[PDB]
Design a protein around this ligand. Sequence first.
Ligand SMILES: O=C(O)[C@@H](CO)OP(=O)(O)O
Ligand SMILES: O=C(O)[C@@H](CO)OP(=O)(O)O
Ligand SMILES: [Ca+2]
Ligand SMILES: [Ca+2]
Lengths: 436, 436
Amino acid sequence: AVSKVYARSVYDSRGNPTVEVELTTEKGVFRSIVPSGASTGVHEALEMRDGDKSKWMGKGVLHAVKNVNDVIAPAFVKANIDVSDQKAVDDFLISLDGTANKSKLGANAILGVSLAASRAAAAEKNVPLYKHLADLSKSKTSPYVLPVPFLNVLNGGSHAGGALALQEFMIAPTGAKTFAEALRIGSEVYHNLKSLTKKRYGASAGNVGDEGGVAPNIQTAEEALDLIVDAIKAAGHDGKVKIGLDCASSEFFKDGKYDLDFKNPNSDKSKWLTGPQLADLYHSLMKRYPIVSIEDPFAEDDWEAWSHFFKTAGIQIVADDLTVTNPKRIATAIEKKAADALLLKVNQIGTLSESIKAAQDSFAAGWGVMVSHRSGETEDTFIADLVVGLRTGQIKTGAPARSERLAKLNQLLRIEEELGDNAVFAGENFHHGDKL
Amino acid sequence: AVSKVYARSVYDSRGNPTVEVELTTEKGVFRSIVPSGASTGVHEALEMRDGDKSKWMGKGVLHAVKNVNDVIAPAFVKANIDVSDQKAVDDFLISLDGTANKSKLGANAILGVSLAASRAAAAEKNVPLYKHLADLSKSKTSPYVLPVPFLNVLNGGSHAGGALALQEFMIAPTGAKTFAEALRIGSEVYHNLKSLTKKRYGASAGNVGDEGGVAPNIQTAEEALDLIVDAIKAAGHDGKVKIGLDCASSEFFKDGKYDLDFKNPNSDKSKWLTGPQLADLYHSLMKRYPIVSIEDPFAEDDWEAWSHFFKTAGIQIVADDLTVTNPKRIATAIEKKAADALLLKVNQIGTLSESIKAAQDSFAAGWGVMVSHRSGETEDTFIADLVVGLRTGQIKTGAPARSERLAKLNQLLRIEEELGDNAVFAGENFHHGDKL
Ligand SMILES: O=C(O)[C@@H](CO)OP(=O)(O)O
Ligand SMILES: O=C(O)[C@@H](CO)OP(=O)(O)O
Ligand SMILES: [Ca+2]
Ligand SMILES: [Ca+2]
């Protein structure tokens, strides 16, 4: 039974405060650390920020922490909830908040308790977290599916100087036979890429962005793509490694058009593209490079551009800012046949129950699910057991650099080793890992 | 009693393989993750690298892992050693290796077992790791000393483009009243610094180096120092924050002289400095900026330059490459009155026993001890409990960015909270935290 609920302020990988929750039961203390989210959000669960400019640049979570300690904890202990019943935990939490976006107690306050309980439930059950997550989500267990990690290697857009408007370039080692192998290959690709970068762009070009990829001053998409292909080649892994893109196109959508030189800042408006011209540019890149996945190709409300594109895309199309892990948005996306994969962010919705349901509805529509990290990550490895539990076959948790990233990948290495013959690597089948 | 000893290959924060050890006793499984070291080392414990260019760029640890699994594990289990007796554990390990630099089994193979055992011992004892570390090192426990964190904020030298020859600029929040406060202040300084950098040097300048600091193209020491002072000022923390430098001067020592423009590469040799001219430059910086600590001011064998300088320095002088956590080197350093603080790196010596002894001998000579991280860190938080256990009052574990860094700082936040009135923040007294 849960005897105590406590929260403290700890630090995320960007040096900003975040909430850490500790839950006590007769089996010990279970902890969870929440990734940074949005404190301002239409369609997404709102995390609570103190707003006191005199402390942590206005990013404290002291209120959030108080909410846990002073509001939830006592109500929670007295409720006598069975942690094995995740939905009862989550329904309790939600009912306490009373708002649609968790803006009363905060999504950061609520998620921390929701995930800790799942750790307490597995412990109680005497099973590894991923098996308990598999039970909650009613996923197939024979075998378990290890995911293809979509490793960030290079950043553009708002995350770099240079003219490149596309935000993230990932490598996906789909041709490996095991998680361990996929990870070794991805790291060698990454190290070759860091060598090439430093050689071509300067010592400076080798420093990393928030998720661990390089961010050199690049002008075009072809420039970024050719660099990556060179790296794969230099590593000796031609054909075993594919590319994934995160266009984050909401960032350069202006006036019904897309500005590919949005950093300009004398951008020639005669050069802005309509959804359809943009789709032609993507098709061109897709014919010349081994791209297998494109995230947010079009803006967050540009429904017609997604649909159109979806009709001839032929590769996995990931909804991130279009859906913000929001069920009403997902249902819309499904209905309009806008894409076929959801970027799942547990803190964008606020509870484990609602995260698992969002994935199930995706799976039910034949969509794939990519479990994702956040910009501001922690040493918490929760999403590693969750990706295995959900059997999605694909995770986006950063480059093979910075331990808030490696903590997850390291955890997948342990899970694989632990499963023995009961695990399969999604490989080329990452899109439908759930159905393998 | 220890029933099993197992090792696996996991990844460090730079994407290179490292060894992870798991030790089983009747109290559970205790794990340790070793930081990356040197595979080539005069005066230091050698870590074992596979050298197979076809796997991980020749950085695998498969041999190291085999050494643990096939050599140590069986010998170790059969020996029936009491984990509470750290020295018996370490003596056993050393005797198995049989070399002065652990080059038979590897320092990476040996350290992993040596630290896991200490976790197993604390568990057995029913105490937090830091209390067990305090017991082993015979440190004062009333109160416990929380350290001033020496946060990396900006890198130069071999770690950046630009002409700046000094390798690391740290900030030490000595004027805070608690660990929690010191950390909040350091983070605000750091965030202001990242703002200023991006504003003055470009979007690119904001990417981070291996330890989390920025590495913009800077020309001079004064340029770096003025930036940092601006950041402290902008954060509103003037007077509560000091500066620490890591000169890594072995890197620009050539021909009995020091090249401050070693990246040149048409360096005017008439401009190289002798130990004494170099000391005059340091004195100049020390008069204009709040520098409280200088690491490796002079080259690793330039005994006379250290001594000379030590006579009028007046601030803490840290031995890193001069001593490489090597007892014979430490004794020499003490004897020649070359400095008064040791940078302690547990993996440079290979066992917990020898690390604790190196610190004790330092303390006995009136030296301070700065526990240090490594370039390639992990999610393991061992050095956080060790710094508290040793009561050193000072830790160098990176900038407030990248979780292989924050994992340690987050852990110090928990320890502080746990100690209540039994903890003091070293503050201005960091140099002699042991004597507080
Ligand atoms: O997936 C992520 O980590 C990023 C962008 O893809 O999202 P956010 O920055 O909002 O966390
Ligand atoms: O202290 C550290 O982290 C660095 C430099 O100060 O040492 P190394 O790169 O050898 O780990
Ligand atoms: Ca995205
Ligand atoms: Ca150093």
